[PDB]
Amino acid sequence: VLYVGSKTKEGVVHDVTTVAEWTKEQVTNVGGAVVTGVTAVAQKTVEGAGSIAAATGFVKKD
Amino acid sequence: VLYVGSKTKEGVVHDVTTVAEWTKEQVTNVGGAVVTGVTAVAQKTVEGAGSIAAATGFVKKD
Amino acid sequence: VLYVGSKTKEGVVHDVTTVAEWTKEQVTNVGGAVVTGVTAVAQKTVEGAGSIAAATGFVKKD
Amino acid sequence: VLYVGSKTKEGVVHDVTTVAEWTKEQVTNVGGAVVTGVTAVAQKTVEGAGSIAAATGFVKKD
Amino acid sequence: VLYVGSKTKEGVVHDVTTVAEWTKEQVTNVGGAVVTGVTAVAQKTVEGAGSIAAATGFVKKD
Amino acid sequence: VLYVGSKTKEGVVHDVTTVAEWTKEQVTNVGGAVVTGVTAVAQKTVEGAGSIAAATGFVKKD
């Protein structure tokens, strides 16, 4: 591995756009996950057996 | 592996667009996952047997 | 691994945009996760078996 | 000549763009003009008989 | 000539852009002009017969 | 000539941009002009017959 005069981009997230106006919202929840904001994961390396990379709105009940 | 004068992009997400106006919304939930925002995962490397990369709105009840 | 005159970007998140105006919101919750803000994870390296990288709105009840 | 609430632009040059990457170049020259940079002339008034306005890479051997 | 509430621009040059990366260059020259940088002339008034306004890379051997 | 509430700009040069990285360069010269930096001339008035306004990389051998 060697770079000579490059422009690399590994695991990037940019220029995500969202606007809200007059957005009525109701949420009822009983013992469970609920997500409403803007999630943006950006990783480079994840290792390990059985692992969980970039989980959002998760419910784990083994 | 060697780069000479390139522009690489590995695992990227950009220019995602969303707008909301007058968006009434109701959500009822009982012990389960519910997701409403904008999820944007961008990874480069994931390793490991049985792993789970980029999970969103997950329910695991083994 | 060696770089000569490059511009690398590993695990980056930028230029995420969100605006709110007149956004009525209600949330009821009983023993569960609920998230509404803007989550932005950006990592480079994660190791370890069974690990969980970048979790948001998580419920773990083993 | 009289202006009332205008926006005039006389003899202007803007937003010229040039980039260079890995640009090998050789030049041999014997008693003559050679130009390689970016020339940008912008004048308003030139007067006089036989005059020469905005000359670039000139050779005059009368 | 009279201005009332205007925005005039006479003989202007702006927002010229140039970048260099890994630009090998060789130049041989024998008794002649050679130019490589970025020339940007901006004048308003030039008068006089036989005059030479905004000359770049000139060779005059009368 | 009279101005009332204007914003004039006569003979101006601004916002010129140049960057250099890893720019190998060789120059041989024998009795001649060679220029490599960034020249930026900005005048308002020049008068006189046979005059030479804004000359760069000049060779005069009458």
Q: Tell me the C-alpha distance between F3 and B23, whole Å.
A: 55
Count of Cβ atoms closer than 10 Å to residue D41 Cβ = 23
- Chains F and B make contact, 3+ CB pairs within 8 Å: no
Helix (H) or strand (E) run with residue F3 in it: strand F2-4
At C38, give phi and psi (nearest 5°). Answer: -100, 110
On whether D44 is known to bind a ligand per the annotation, the reply is no
Q: Tell me the C-alpha distance between A34 and C58, whole Å.
A: 9
Q: Tell me the C-alpha distance between F46 and F52, whole Å.
A: 9
Q: Which two tokens stand for residue E25?
A: 């260059």
**Strand extents, DSSP E, A1-62:** 2-4, 9-21, 34-35, 40-42, 45-46, 52-60
Q: Tell me the C-alpha distance between E10 and F3, whole Å.
A: 15
Contacts of A9 in chain C (CB under 8 A): 8-9, 12
What's the gap between Cα A9 and its chain centre?
18
Q: Which two tokens stand for residue F16?
A: 């010129």
Inter-chain CB proximity A54 and B43 less than 8 Å: yes
Count of Cβ atoms closer than 10 Å to residue B7 Cβ = 11
Do F12 and D14 touch, CB atoms closer than 8 A? no
Pick from A37, F27, B12, F48: nearest CA to E29 = F27
Pick from B12, B45, B54, B21: nearest CA to A16 = B12
Structure determined via: cryo-EM
3-class secondary structure, D32: coil
Distance from CA of E53 to the nearest CA of F (A): 5
Structure's resolution in angstroms: 3.4
Q: Which two tokens stand for residue C5?
A: 């005159």
Q: Tell me the C-alpha distance between C5 and A19, whole Å.
A: 39
Query: For residue A48, what are the CA distances in angstroms to A60, B50, C17, C47, C50?
Result: 18, 10, 33, 6, 6
Distance from CA of B56 to the nearest CA of A (A): 5
Count of Cβ atoms closer than 10 Å to residue C24 Cβ = 10
Amino acid in position A56: T
Do C30 and B28 touch, CB atoms closer than 8 A? no
Amino acid in position D7: K
Mutate one of B22, B35, B61, B62 to test the A interface: name it (highest A CB count within 10 A).
B35
Burial of D27 (0-12, 13-18, 19+ CB in 10 A): middle
**Strand extents, DSSP E, D1-62:** 2-4, 9-21, 34-35, 40-42, 45-46, 52-60
Distance from CA of B48 to the nearest CA of A (A): 4
Inter-chain CB proximity E17 and D14 less than 8 Å: no
Query: For residue F43, what are the CA distances in angstroms to B33, C35, D49, F21?
Result: 70, 62, 21, 31
